[PDB]
Subunit: 50 residues, 2 copies
């Protein structure tokens, strides 16, 4: 509604805000930065051994 | 919707924007400045003589 959020107004969010990275509410600004746990490289078989 | 109508700003508009000063559309920010013709002191009897 302000609109001045997306040009020079970068946002950084934790993994809680991102939540499920598969689904995006379409209101998330492009270029959103999020800190998330390694769900891609750290596969389930690797964690069980650890 | 942006919300930045006026908080420490000032909006200057001509007499066209003000229009009829009796009615305000309730969206005009407080502190609006208009350059209106003298309808108060310059009464109609004075205008006819001039």
């Amino acid at each position: 509604s302000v609109g001045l959020t997306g040009y020079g107004y970068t946002w950084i969010v934790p993994s809680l805000v991102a939540g499920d990275t598969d689904t995006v509410p379409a209101e998330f600004p492009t270029g959103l930065i999020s800190v998330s746990y390694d769900e891609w490289d750290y596969g389930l078989p690797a964690r069980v051994r650890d």
